[PDB]
Design a protein around this ligand. Structure first.
Ligand SMILES: *[C@@H]1O[C@H](CO)[C@@H](O)[C@H](O)[C@H]1NC(C)=O
Length: 142
């Protein structure tokens, strides 16, 4: 497989990246209701993970979406803000250490062109400490 990448257990194409760098959160298991997500349908995300350090306000995520060799999306979102805007139940921003189980539902735009997309997200705390690194490949049939 790719360098510094671990498959995540479960029905998901997700990998953990930058493993040689200490990460504050362990992503134990990830499941998606359609194993390949389907355009124009709901996608259900089940996640099981651990948090080892109190995540406080100021964490941020560098998210990059890429189609082929074209860089489609690159920006930084405020982590707490995003979890609160998307109304994740139980992810109140001061994230205490512990065992977490998260279920979140998102809708896939049907308008999305068919093709092979690569997503890369790196989340860091206010102190710029690496929380996690995740990468994935999704292929949409035409
Ligand atoms: C799909 O998800 C949305 C988001 O909450 C929900 O309101 C809707 O009822 C769901 N529809 C189906 C068919 O699952």
């Amino acid at each position: 497989p790719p360098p510094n990448t671990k498959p995540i257990n479960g029905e998901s194409p997700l990998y953990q990246c930058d493993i040689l760098d200490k990460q504050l959160v362990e992503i134990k298991e990830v499941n998606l209701d359609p194993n390949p997500p389907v355009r124009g349908e709901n996608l259900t995300i089940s996640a099981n993970g651990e948090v080892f350090e109190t995540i406080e306000e100021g964490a941020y995520i560098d998210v990059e979406v890429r189609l082929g060799y074209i860089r489609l999306l690159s920006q930084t979102f405020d982590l707490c803000e995003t979890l609160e805007d998307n109304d994740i139940e139980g992810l109140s921003c001061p994230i205490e250490p512990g065992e977490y189980n998260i279920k979140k539902i998102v809708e896939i735009p049907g308008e999305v062109p068919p093709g092979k997309y690569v997503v890369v997200a790196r989340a860091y705390t206010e102190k710029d400490d690496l929380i996690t690194c995740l990468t994935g490949e999704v292929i949409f049939p035409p």
